[PDB]
């Protein structure tokens, strides 16, 4: 009979086609999403392993079922590698490595610390926050966070394009939040974690730091560490950490503050609550296969290799920014200080939705973005470009400068098609239907795919 | 650094751990009702380039583009999941994004119910799952019991079956909006037909968490809960022998054209179920797991997987009949499923003692609270699971042989019990005592020799 040892190639050749088609797409394309990245073969070997076949319900040395002597060493190693990666003292810090992905990691923390219908503040979604930080329409609550808890957004200053820390302090005093969130999806500059902390300390609230995008940078110490000012830090292990899709939750432990009036020490009460909310509250069975893959990625994060990568990522953002500025493009917050280069297309007479679709057609995956004063919510006037993706294929300043030329030609096609159509649906149809436009795009595509294929791609060759 | 270096060369600390866990799995007799050995085909898909794609949203309606290939994958995973549980795509849909089993349920609760609405599920010690809702005397333990108000229904201690009589009685008082038809530790089948009558009367939704029996339901070797339930959650890694993920099957199209008004009434599950998955609870879908699940669902459709599932049932029967004929007492009489609920009080031993001893001789089984027990720390009873070893091509004769090893293990447990006081002591006496140690070390070797011979799905090394 069937052994279950048959290769995917032979076993399910419908699925094997699809793996190779998505592998080819990744290699011939210019990936320009800030959240995307190309994962190591080392980690993907661990991801697709026999660790799939273990129910290690619980935590090391406190499992529901036994026979977990090996996975305990793995989960404990993943911890000591995560503490080492963000250079944390195991006396002062712990970490939970179980979170299935980034989103659950945050929900775990909310559940661990807050009661239902407690008050949460995060950067607003169109100002560049994530759904997980809490988001409601006028008509309906959209985030799970905004259902179980009461979320109020803090916003940017439309002028500077920065987090209005002045108004954040103003609203907190009124709203009385118990947790304020220090993270972004679309924000070029850094976060004044120091100031955020002062706001919380004053309004007697917790400071969560969702360092999803910056995790790879923070690890390498090419950015200031939010661990200096925050007590709770959530993260994805797959954004700039270039690992498998999982999550982490860093938390404080030991002594908080020895009260001089009483004289006795006050303990941090995060560790027990954070872990209890992960399991047995929100999640169930851990994905030991992902935990292993994450520990391999955290091992890489500690190497000097990954530092130089992260130093290059920054310069490839700088390079891409300076290249755009010098083609008459407007960047939100003027320039980037990280890995993403928020772009404003209103001042070149184009929107995100038009640019996005055209770039996609020439094998350039980038995402539209809402830029301050963008009138139509439907069609955000702006674009978000991401270094880390291509930098992992060993790109350089010259290569990113070359990327922007391809982008620019794409934008010009966009501009020219815009004045020969009315609304977006028309624009998107004119790209496919029109013979002249089609061939102009087909040409640009070839040159882009030719350009991309040359550069190496981490992971396997075939899948 | 290319990032194309092998794990072997790259991180040889981690590579040792993979081989040690691979050896543990091969030399051990895995007897957990959840545990199963996943195919190489699916693990190849799990550890693939699909990790490196943010498919936020749904097919044809992604937040970011460049998802033409993953759309075909996510859509294929759907058509394979509908085909696996023989569903009409006119009448049924499915969401394939759930990260794991637990979130899949939380998605459904969030999709259908308001915060602090009323949920009923089999109690935890009676054999439910934490996700169905569980509170202590002092504090709410389940996330479900925090956001929503959960009341358990229990077994009948006499029969060892779901007291459908009292479920109907309490449900008229409690007025639940959602009742859950699933188990972790229950040998016999669920009268989904009766559960439905309860709900229909108390105007409630019937969720069917078919985690443990998903592989059986697929192969059509037991009752389909799709006949009586409208919502069906499942893990893709229990008896479906797939990668670690979750599904949510739901109704769609027309429910009932009301003859008074005359107009058709739609099922309003599809949009709410999907919205709760994304963009409410989850973010970036694990396309690598979705692919692995689609590979496993392809296998579930084959006649091969039927003969596996027919064998799984007989290997449960075989193990049950073998135990009954050695003086062991099974709860619920027997097993029409894949698990046997054993009672060790009538042979003068508890679960915690048996569990620890069997573990030491490479036999992973889990303790289980026999109905009417109350010893929490020391619950008299054990849960044995076919599917694990059946996937290594075990037979009735092999499972009969498994019980011999178990029996010897129990006897060692009994003998150590009368030479010790508190459980904590018992567990130390196993390690410390020279006579006991060698008797265990002997049993271990014979078990490991026995096990290694049988084949193991997946890779040879990792």
């Amino acid at each position: 009979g069937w052994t279950g040892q048959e290769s995917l190639s032979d076993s399910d050749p419908e699925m094997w086609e699809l793996l190779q088609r998505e592998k080819d797409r990744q290699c011939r394309g210019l990936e320009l999403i800030a959240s995307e990245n190309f994962c190591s073969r080392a980690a993907l070997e661990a991801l697709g392993s026999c660790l799939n076949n273990k129910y290690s319900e619980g935590y090391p040395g406190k499992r529901y079922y036994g026979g977990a002597e090996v996975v305990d060493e793995i989960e404990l190693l993943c911890q000591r590698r995560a503490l080492e990666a963000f250079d944390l003292d195991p006396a002062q810090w712990g970490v939970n490595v179980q979170p299935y992905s980034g989103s659950p990691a945050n929900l775990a923390v909310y559940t661990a610390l807050l009661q239902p219908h407690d008050r949460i503040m995060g950067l607003d979604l169109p100002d560049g926050g994530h759904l997980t930080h809490g988001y409601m329409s006028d008509v309906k609550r959209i985030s799970a966070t905004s259902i179980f808890f009461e979320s109020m957004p803090y916003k940017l200053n439309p002028k500077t394009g920065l987090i209005d820390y002045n108004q954040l302090a103003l609203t907190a005093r009124l709203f009385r939040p118990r947790l304020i969130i220090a993270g972004t999806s679309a924000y070029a500059r850094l976060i004044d974690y120091a100031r955020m902390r002062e706001v919380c300390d004053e309004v007697k609230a917790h400071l969560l730091a969702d360092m999803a995008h910056i995790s790879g940078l923070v690890a390498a110490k090419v950015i200031p560490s939010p661990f200096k000012h925050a007590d709770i830090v959530t993260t994805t292990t797959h954004k700039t950490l270039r690992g498998a899709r999982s999550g982490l939750i860093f938390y404080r432990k030991g002594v908080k503050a020895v009260d001089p009036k009483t004289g006795r020490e006050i303990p941090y009460t995060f560790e027990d609550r954070i872990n209890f909310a992960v399991f047995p509250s929100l999640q169930g069975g851990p994905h030991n296969h992902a935990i292993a893959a994450v520990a391999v990625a955290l091992k890489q994060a500690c190497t000097p290799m990954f530092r130089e990568y992260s130093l290059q990522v920054l310069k490839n953002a700088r390079a891409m920014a300076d290249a755009l500025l010098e083609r008459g493009y407007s960047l939100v917050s003027g320039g980037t200080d990280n890995h993403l280069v928020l772009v404003d297309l209103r001042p070149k007479g184009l929107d995100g939705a038009r640019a996005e679709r055209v770039l996609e057609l020439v094998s350039i995956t980038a995402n539209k973005n809402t830029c301050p004063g963008d009138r139509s919510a439907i069609t955000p006037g702006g674009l978000r470009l991401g270094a880390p993706a291509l930098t992992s294929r060993q790109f350089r300043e010259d290569d990113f400068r070359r990327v922007v030329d391809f982008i620019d030609e794409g934008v010009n096609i966009g501009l020219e098609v815009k004045s020969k159509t009315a609304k977006l649906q028309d624009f998107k149809s004119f790209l496919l239907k029109d013979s002249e436009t089609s061939q102009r795009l087909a040409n640009l595509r070839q040159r882009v795919e030719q350009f991309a294929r040359a550069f190496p791609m981490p992971g396997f060759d075939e899948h």
Side-chain angles (χ1 to χ4, degrees), chain A:
Chain A
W2 175 96
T3 53
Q5 303 196 342
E6 300 85 354
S7 67
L8 178 51
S9 183
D10 302 10
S11 171
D12 192 339
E14 174 156 343
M15 183 62 58
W16 183 253
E17 279 292 334
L18 299 189
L19 283 183
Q20 293 189 297
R21 287 182 44 213
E22 175 59 41
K23 183 58 182 189
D24 202 84
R25 184 197 67 79
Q26 281 176 14
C27 287
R28 76 186 187 251
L30 288 176
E31 196 80 66
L32 286 175
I33 308 291
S35 50
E36 280 279 60
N37 212 309
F38 302 120
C39 182
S40 63
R41 185 200 155 189
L44 285 169
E45 261 195 297
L47 190 64
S49 74
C50 69
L51 292 165
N52 189 75
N53 310 320
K54 183 49 179 194
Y55 241 90
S56 63
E57 272 192 347
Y59 291 99
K62 259 233 196 68
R63 305 292 188 182
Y64 268 26
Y65 323 122
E69 54 266 49
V70 190
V71 299
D72 279 5
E73 297 196 357
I74 280 175
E75 184 154 353
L76 286 162
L77 173 70
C78 187
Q79 292 168 18
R80 292 190 322 281
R81 283 190 172 177
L83 290 179
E84 186 179 319
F86 295 78
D87 193 6
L88 304 175
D89 185 10
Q92 303 193 345
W93 288 86
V95 58
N96 190 308
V97 305
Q98 280 186 43
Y100 294 147
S101 208
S103 300
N106 288 8
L107 184 49
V109 168
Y110 308 150
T111 313
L113 306 190
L114 309 182
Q115 292 293 333
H117 308 305
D118 279 0
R119 295 191 175 170
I120 295 173
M121 289 189 77
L123 183 61
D124 200 356
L125 188 67
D127 286 56
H130 196 265
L131 293 140
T132 58
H133 300 162
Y135 177 52
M136 314 185 299
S137 69
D138 294 304
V139 298
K140 164 182 147 192
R141 309 150 172 286
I142 287 166
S143 179
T145 315
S146 296
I147 286 181
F148 302 130
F149 313 86
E150 301 291 291
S151 71
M152 197 179 73
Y154 63 81
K155 301 251 287 173
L156 296 175
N157 172 20
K159 193 212 158 199
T160 53
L162 307 176
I163 296 153
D164 190 310
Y165 304 90
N166 289 305
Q167 204 180 232
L168 173 50
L170 186 152
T171 56
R173 293 187 194 84
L174 299 188
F175 185 54
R176 302 302 308 184
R178 291 192 60 197
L179 183 131
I180 307 185
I181 311 171
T184 67
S185 176
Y187 191 77
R189 305 319 198 76
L190 310 186
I191 300 169
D192 195 0
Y193 298 107
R195 178 58 184 289
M196 300 283 279
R197 162 62 76 170
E198 291 177 16
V199 178
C200 288
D201 280 1
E202 187 191 330
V203 75
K204 299 171 184 197
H206 300 273
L207 182 62
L208 172 61
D210 191 61
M211 60 159 178
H213 272 96
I214 326 109
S215 47
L217 308 181
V218 167
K221 310 198 215 288
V222 305
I223 297 291
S225 183
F227 289 79
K228 298 181 200 159
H229 304 280
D231 280 2
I232 314 302
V233 187
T234 52
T235 183
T236 63
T237 65
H238 61 269
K239 218 153 265 216
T240 45
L241 275 185
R242 195 168 55 179
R245 285 168 160 290
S246 184
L248 305 168
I249 306 172
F250 302 87
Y251 52 79
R252 281 276 197 166
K253 53 179 292 186
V255 184
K256 180 167 185 176
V258 182
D259 183 56
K261 301 214 73 213
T262 59
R264 193 177 304 152
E265 67 195 344
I266 305 172
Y268 281 114
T269 67
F270 293 126
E271 184 162 56
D272 298 347
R273 292 193 292 172
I274 294 287
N275 290 303
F276 200 84
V278 173
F279 184 89
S281 302
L282 284 164
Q283 293 189 177
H287 291 218
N288 281 288
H289 58 98
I291 291 168
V294 165
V296 176
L298 289 167
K299 152 69 183 198
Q300 294 168 5
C302 289
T303 63
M305 177 273 290
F306 185 83
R307 175 168 177 74
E308 306 176 40
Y309 164 80
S310 286
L311 286 164
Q312 185 70 52
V313 164
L314 287 179
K315 295 186 297 171
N316 285 353
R318 192 65 64 188
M320 188 157 54
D322 295 319
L324 286 162
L325 280 166
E326 296 168 13
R327 286 160 174 284
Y329 288 96
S330 325
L331 311 182
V332 190
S333 79
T336 183
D337 291 40
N338 65 5
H339 64 271
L340 63 99
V341 296
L342 295 189
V343 168
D344 191 351
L345 286 178
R346 294 172 289 164
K348 290 210 77 167
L350 198 60
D351 53 72
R354 282 184 170 71
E356 176 172 30
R357 175 58 181 154
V358 169
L359 288 168
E360 190 207 345
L361 282 160
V362 295
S363 308
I364 307 172
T365 50
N367 59 298
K368 69 180 192 274
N369 182 58
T370 315
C371 298
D374 164 65
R375 290 171 283 197
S376 61
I378 171 172
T379 48
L383 219 76
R384 189 184 72 181
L385 306 178
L390 293 171
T391 309
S392 302
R393 308 186 65 178
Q394 299 156 2
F395 271 46
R396 302 198 164 289
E397 289 82 354
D398 290 18
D399 306 300
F400 265 95
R401 271 191 280 284
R402 180 76 176 292
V403 161
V404 172
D405 192 358
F406 294 120
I407 293 174
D408 204 355
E409 293 175 45
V411 173
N412 292 304
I413 296 169
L415 289 171
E416 293 166 45
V417 171
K418 178 184 173 171
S419 60
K420 300 176 179 174
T421 51
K423 194 51 198 297
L424 186 54
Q425 64 277 1
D426 313 2
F427 180 95
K428 290 193 185 158
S429 191
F430 191 92
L431 292 171
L432 299 176
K433 301 298 157 174
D434 188 7
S435 185
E436 185 191 355
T437 307
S438 170
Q439 293 171 301
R440 286 188 64 199
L441 285 165
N443 181 324
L444 177 50
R445 178 165 171 162
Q446 174 71 244
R447 289 184 285 117
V448 172
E449 290 190 359
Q450 277 198 111
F451 173 67
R453 281 175 195 283
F455 295 87
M457 176 63 79
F460 299 98
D461 312 3
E462 304 219 334
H463 58 278

